[PDB]
């Protein structure tokens with residue numbers, strides 16, 4: 001499952 | 009300018 | 017260490033340059049140097065630290081998963097296992113370095129909710145990465161270390177931060193992934209994501225346009241996981 | 247060096263694993279180890295060597311170009327220049343390592359046209375990368391070293407290889423880029439690409455379907471450059 005990505 | 013890429 | 021001679025401000029400047037150059041190992045080394053100067057980190061600096069190490073460990077995790085898959089299909093000589101172990105040890109080293117920075121002494125000096133939650137979330141994340149590759153006597157203790165850090169972060173965030181705060185939302189997202197992927201607790205994962213989403217939705221009316229954009233982005237990531245899991 | 251204890255076959259196996267894991271620094275280290283075993287490389291092994299180092303230097307070049315652009319816009323303190331110099335020195339080190347492998351002793355043992363042309367093309371490419379960042383007393387000598395290696399490769403390839411051979415085509419593509427980007431010779435670049443394309447086109451009728459696919463791919467890259475340049 002995807003966790004938090006780096007900020008946009 | 010693009011040079012040779014790695015092989016496909 | 018090797019960054020001891022460089023000015024704090026120069027380390028931060030170079031971390032930003034390294035990010036633009038997509039030199040994440042350099043970025044992490046610069047930020048480790050900055051932390052080791054002993055001063056607290058600003059919000060921007062905390063985010064630089066996080067981005068750097070996320071990219072480094074992210075590459076290692078992706079490589080580990082490729083190699084682990086090949087190894088499990090093999091089950092030839094010792095090379096696949098040896099190389100998986102090499103990548104694993106390198107990954108463990110990076111996690112131990114991050115955890116070391118948090119313990120010496122970022123968490124203990126972090127008094128504001130935003131900083132303390134950020135660092136405890138990081139602590140949970142890096143124990144979670146250790147858990148992903150753990151198989152020995154301490155594996156349950158690694159999982160519990162992640163859980164404990166996330167839980168302390170959750171308790172502080174619930175008391176001190178609005179339900180739309182991006183750090184609070186990101187924490188909940190990652191803790192929910194912990195539940196689903198590490199702790200074998202999919203129902204807890206789903207409940208956490210749902211309650212987080214709903215409480216954030218209810219508070220969006222208070223936000224500026226710019227804050228709304230940030231909160232709703234993470235809400236969408238919660239919703240995406242809920243869709244995957246149900 | 248550090249790979250001296252590992253079997254040649256294990257180094258090659260691990261290079262392939264590192265490629266699948268997108269661990270190109272590891273891949274390059276494994277292939278350096280394999281070269282240092284002292285035996286000639288097969289076709290497949292030559293390609294592993296090339297892929298590894300292309301990826302490593304490619305990342306460095308991309309970072310160098312980002313930093314060089316920031317530096318030229320700055321023209322603040324010494325940090326941008328210092329970090330550009332750090333990346334530059336690392337890049338130079340990798341190029342010197344590759345050139346060292348070619349000189350000790352890959353080229354001198356390469357007797358077949360395919361191997362010798364491959365290595366001389368590599369030699370041209372890595373001198374070209376050194377030329378991209380060169381500014382001192384030896385810059386003209388660096389450019390001439392690239393030119394000389396490419397020219398020897400061209401002379402052998404014209405005598406010994408069909409005009410559709412992928413190594414011959416790739417050499418011509420890269421030498422044409424040398425002319426355009428390094429030697430300030432756009433007309434030579436264009437002429438070389440055009441003649442290469444045309445001579446390959448004329449020989450496609452001799453090829454199997456699989457060889458045709460390979461040759462026409464590189465022909466399209468020649469055509470793409472001709473389009474960019476005209």
Ligand SMILES: *Cc1ccc(-n2ccnc2-c2ccccc2C)cc1Br
Nearest residue numbers: 005006007066182183186187230233
């Ligand atoms: C753990 C965490 C949570 C939130 C952020 N953050 C800070 C500012 N923007 C964001 C962000 C990050 C990822 C996706 C969306 C948003 C709004 C940083 C970290 Br680390």
Ligand SMILES: *Cc1ccc(-n2ccnc2-c2ccccc2C)cc1Br
Nearest residue numbers: 013014015296412413416417460463
């Ligand atoms: C310099 C060079 C030239 C050609 C190859 N090569 C070998 C097999 N396929 C290819 C290739 C590479 C890039 C694009 C297309 C093709 C057909 C390898 C090197 Br190194």
